[PDB]
């Protein structure tokens, strides 16, 4: 068994975690664009949700900002 950096032994698997058949469904995603009609309440709600561990709407919003804004 391969020893982890923390010192806890484990088993090494060469196959990716995303290659599992059950995980294949969640791999395909539709990239929504929440930057259409932005509202300060909407942005605040997205940030609040990302604080608790959502991390999805914030990621899509950041992707939209990095392409819509030329200076950024």
């Amino acid at each position: 068994r391969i020893l982890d950096i923390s010192g806890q032994p484990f088993d090494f698997d060469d196959e990716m975690q995303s290659r599992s058949d059950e995980l294949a469904m969640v791999m395909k995603r539709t990239q929504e664009h929440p930057s259409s009609g932005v509202t300060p309440n909407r942005a605040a709600q997205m940030l609040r949700d990302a604080e608790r561990g959502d991390l999805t709407a914030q990621a899509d919003l950041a992707f939209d900002m990095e392409e819509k804004d030329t200076h950024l």
Binding site: T39, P40, N41, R42, A43, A44
Partner: protein, 69 residues
């Protein structure tokens, strides 16, 4: 009043014509909005009417009700 004036078309008296003129003047005042027709005496209730004044605008972003910034 106006029906009685309509009936007395062959020869109208001075008072009947004066009353009809006063009635039509009151009706024009009501139409122009310068006076209220009133409400029925049995219970306080005014007749329903359409919106005389109406404006349209897009939703107000950046208003002080946002409280998000």
């Amino acid at each position: 009043v106006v029906a009685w004036f309509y009936l007395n078309e062959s020869q109208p008296t001075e008072q009947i014509t004066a009353t009809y003129r006063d009635t039509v003047r009151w009706l024009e005042q009501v139409r122009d909005g310068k006076t209220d027709p009133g409400v029925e005496s049995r219970t306080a209730a005014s007749p329903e009417g359409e919106d005389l004044v109406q404006v349209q605008s897009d939703p107000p972003v950046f208003s002080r009700k946002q409280k998000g910034f």
